[PDB]
Amino acid sequence: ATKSVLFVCLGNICRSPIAEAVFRKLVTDQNISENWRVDSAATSGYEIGNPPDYRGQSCMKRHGIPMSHVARQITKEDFATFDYILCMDESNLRDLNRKSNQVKTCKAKIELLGSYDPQKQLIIEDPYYGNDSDFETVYQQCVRCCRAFLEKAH
């Protein structure tokens, strides 16, 4: 792989594992998975070691997208190694810019994933205190933003 994207949320259990899995399927379906390094991570240590929110798995089973992930927190190395760090909401973004300024090498462009949505839904909102319709909304946003991001990065 010589391209790489890291999807990021606060816990790495609801949103970023879905965006990760949606993007991996996309590239796999188009024969280019070998060209991409794809992963997801948390800004915080709340959920380190945990699989994705079960409500998330259920949604992704409905759409036939496999999801295997163990939550982890972003590291200093991630800012050097990834081409793109795509986050969910403004809070993630503040936190990621903060962390990016504590390291020498930040190769990554740090952006909101929803900046790629043709339907212009900027923020992918945390579904943790929501229900299945919200996980569905997050899945749908991810599909739109990942097709676009893949089509053409900014």
Side-chain angles (χ1 to χ4, degrees):
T2 56
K3 288 193 76 54
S4 63
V5 59
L6 179 67
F7 298 93
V8 177
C9 66
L10 172 58
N12 188 211
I13 67 163
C14 305
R15 293 167 288 182
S16 59
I18 290 169
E20 178 197 355
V22 168
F23 188 83
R24 183 159 306 109
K25 182 165 197 311
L26 223 85
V27 287
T28 298
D29 287 348
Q30 293 189 19
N31 302 326
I32 58 171
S33 76
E34 283 141 79
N35 300 335
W36 278 91
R37 186 181 167 221
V38 188
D39 192 20
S40 73
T43 52
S44 81
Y46 274 115
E47 292 288 338
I48 289 177
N50 295 341
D53 193 296
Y54 190 68
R55 296 167 302 165
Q57 287 287 353
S58 295
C59 164
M60 294 286 276
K61 263 132 66 54
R62 293 197 288 96
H63 303 272
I65 310 210
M67 199 170 56
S68 156
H69 188 70
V70 181
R72 78 175 182 81
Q73 188 166 5
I74 189 163
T75 64
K76 282 169 155 273
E77 192 169 32
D78 297 321
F79 298 91
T81 56
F82 286 91
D83 300 322
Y84 291 99
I85 294 165
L86 298 182
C87 63
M88 302 298 145
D89 61 40
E90 305 214 74
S91 176
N92 299 159
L93 184 67
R94 281 181 292 283
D95 213 334
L96 291 164
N97 290 320
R98 178 175 47 86
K99 298 191 211 272
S100 77
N101 290 313
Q102 304 176 136
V103 312
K104 60 162 293 209
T105 308
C106 187
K107 178 183 78 168
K109 312 188 204 292
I110 299 175
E111 315 178 82
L112 288 167
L113 174 56
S115 73
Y116 288 96
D117 190 6
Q119 298 181 28
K120 298 199 80 196
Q121 304 218 280
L122 187 69
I123 309 301
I124 308 172
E125 288 293 352
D126 183 358
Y128 186 79
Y129 293 107
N131 68 20
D132 301 333
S133 71
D134 303 288
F135 282 86
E136 176 71 7
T137 295
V138 165
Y139 166 87
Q140 288 300 338
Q141 288 175 98
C142 289
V143 165
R144 297 196 310 270
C145 300
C146 287
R147 194 198 300 112
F149 161 69
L150 181 57
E151 216 164 307
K152 199 280 290 299
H154 31 89

